Amino acid sequence: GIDPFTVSKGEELFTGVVPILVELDGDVNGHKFSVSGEGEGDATYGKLTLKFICTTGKLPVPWPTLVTTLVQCFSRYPDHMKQHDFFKSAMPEGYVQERTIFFKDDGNYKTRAEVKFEGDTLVNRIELKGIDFKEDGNILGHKLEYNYNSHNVYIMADKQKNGIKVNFKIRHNIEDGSVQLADHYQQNTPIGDGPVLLPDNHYLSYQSALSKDPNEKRDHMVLLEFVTAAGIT
Ligand code: NA
Fold this sequence. Notes:
Elements: E1 18-28, E2 31-42, E3 47-54, H1 86-89, E4 95-103, E5 108-118, E6 121-131, E7 151-158, E8 163-173, E9 179-190, E10 202-211, E11 220-230
The protein binds sodium ion (NA).
């Protein structure tokens, strides 16, 4: 376990503005790519501000399809729900997030992310594997609009893994006015062996805004996100 003179642990680590670093290696139908991200999280306000860069050249999938993969420890938990915040409770040692994302009538992503502090910086290191995609489909054919809807993310305890299980549905707008559904199944497990907060059923309410940096010539995404826990009282 951690040093019992650790200065900041659990939710204490999130009372201020925290630098964030994200690193992702991906392979979707053999199209390999990497993404790096930097920004800040201010959990008191549920606020994330990040800029992501495809470091290998052109991103072979639409940026919106990576939003859910690219640090739920920055969610704003109401005071009356603080005992349900698994994500912060696992820090600084961190947690592993695993997902399968089923794109309706297309392929799936499977992801594994390790989220932990490296000093003052909250780091998310991710591997993403996509298979079974249609080369001329909405994903590999880049037919998804550069925008994002608000969603609820449903969280319950997984006592067997000393963690949580999560599911939700993302609707990505297609350029023809239709919808590309992405069904997310998720589990998180702590990296350390200490106590964590196993929550009652609740959800996170997400808002996401995607933009471009007018001075950035690399393939990139600027993301502004607000996340608030809810559904208890
Ligand atoms: Na309860």
